[PDB]
């Protein structure tokens with residue numbers, strides 16, 4: 080419906096660029112418009128869209144379609160049954176530089192993460208993060224350069240900084256958690272207390 | 280008595296904040312000779328942690344009194360007699376858990392994770408003995424603490440991830456042993472630094488079940504390092 | 512052992528947060544037969560307050576578990592056996608202090624202030640017995656609690672100022688007895704209202720050394736009336 084309009088808008092706007100993602104996810108959780116929107120983003124449109132989103136710029140006609148196809152894909156998908164561990168590397172800047180440990184923050188653009196740690200270091204060595212979440216979308220079947228096996232988190236998705244540390248090499252090592260998981264998440268029941276830690 | 284009965288009594292005792300009951304329940308479960316589950320190990324551990332922990336606190340209070348009131352000889356004889364009553368309770372609690380460790384816990388430990396846990400525990404209770412011991416007995420309790428912590432350290436470094444909460448918890452307690460019991464800021468800082476450095480190098484090894492357990496012990500490791508090395 | 516020796520052990524045990532040791536030290540001081548000073552009375556009181564208070568808390572926790580976890584009949588038995596172990600401990604505590612009260616504390620209390628304190632205390636420990644008792648045994652303790660509280664109430668109303676912290680504290684504990692043990696919001700509100708009204712009518716009777724003691728108990732009795740008639 081509103082999807083049929085979007086799927087029509089996307090091939091009108093991006094032609095063969097949009098169409099090449101049709102049927103790339105034969106599982107069928109997402110519609111043609113959603114599959115094409117995430118494809119377009121993951122393949123190359125991440126750069127211009129995330130730049131417009133992080134700068135608070137007006138999205139051009141074509142950017143609006145990709146963003147509305149992705150937002151719709153995240154409304155559909157929702158939270159998964161299991162918590163997933165993904166990885167992310169950035170070069171010069173990171174959304175969570177401004178967030179102190181225990182506090183929550185977000186990226187204004189979309190957060191790309193990888194199921195492979197080695198794949199993340201290949202994107203950046205400024206800051207390497209370990210993410211734990213449930214509301215991410217697996218796009219490895221739509222677009223998968225470097226066999227990145229990407230799990231994308233929605234824009235403005237709130238993440239809690241569990242650890243923010245630095246390497247003797249000067250790499251910041253972060254542990255982020257989807258703030259919606261709660262306080263109980265990531266704790267093996269009774270373990271920390273059993274560990275009889277030498278601290279008041 | 281039945282295993283699941285004593286375990287439920289221990290879970291009850293925990294809620295009622297009756298840790299001497301909780302420890303006695305888990306002492307019997309252990310004396311049955313059968314390997315404890317992860318739940319039963321943690322119940323035995325939190326039970327004795329609180330049983331011993333209360334006496335450690337009470338000992339640190341009466342000892343702090345003895346210093347600030349070094350006056351009347353009958354008043355000091357009251358303070359000493361009371362410190363020694365608490366010391367005797369400490370030594371009795373520790374011996375009981377060190378007895379459960381050597382006779383039942385360490386020999387029945389199949390997987391390396393539970394072995395490092397019980398060996399770190401043996402290092403802990405020998406360290407608790409060291410805090411109250413003096414002379415020749417101190418030398419022995421200290422050497423036994425270091426040995427049990429080192430044994431656990433070598434097994435963990437070979438069969439566990441640098442982010443494992445049991446490996447990190449061992450690193451924290453062993454470094455604190457060097458700082459408090461051997462008064463070595465250098466050896467303490469070296470253990471904490473290496474353990475933290477090896478854990479941030481391999482954050483990919485974090486478990487989706489115990490990642491917040493790991494990040495918390497990594498914050499205590501780092502926080503100690505900045506405390507031990509930072510000038511005002 | 513010597514009086515000043517046991518008192519120092521009790522002051523030590525208190526700092527070490529070892530109240531069972533603190534109570535046992537003060538039990539021996541009481542069992543000698545000589546009247547306790549204001550310092551020794553307060554040491555015996557805070558010792559048993561914590562000794563009993565811990566068992567009351569543990570009892571309220573295991574009882575709250577028994578209700579919310581009704582499935583395995585073997586689990587319910589474990590809960591009952593444990594509640595009854597704590598009940599046994601609670602019963603033994605109150606008996607030991609009620610024994611110290613009738614045999615040593617109440618007979619040696621010369622001044623009325625001390626007699627009110629020990630009689631309010633007798634009402635308190637009989638009320639603690641009532642919380643765990645059932646049937647015929649419950650009826651005996653509730654009647655003994657009310658009697659001991661009423662005895663102190665009549666002595667306090669005649670020989671003490673309406674703002675005396677021991678008189679006000681008695682009013683708070685007696686009103687709470689009516690509310691919790693006799694489930695009478697009307698009798699509880701009447702005791703609290705009259706006690707508060709008589710205290711604000713005679714604020715001139717406040718002592719310049721213990722006025723904050725009185726105003727605090729006058730706030731706890733004021734917060735209860737607004738809570739109960741809401």
Ligand SMILES: NC(=O)c1ccc[n+]([C@@H]2C[C@H](COP(=O)(O)OP(=O)(O)OC[C@H]3O[C@@H](n4cnc5c(N)ncnc54)[C@H](O)[C@@H]3O)[C@@H](O)[C@H]2O)c1
Pocket residue numbers: 120121122123125126129133166167168169170171172173174175186187188189190191192193198199200202203227228229230
């Ligand atoms: N980085 C990864 O680890 C990673 C992992 C898996 C897949 N991918 C894919 C790789 C590719 C692009 O993603 P990615 O490089 O992560 O995009 P990005 O837009 O998020 O990052 C590009 C660069 O911009 C910088 N930057 C990032 N966020 C901010 C911010 N909030 N504020 C200021 N500067 C910032 C930083 O320098 C980063 O390296 C898509 O094909 C993704 O599917 C990336």
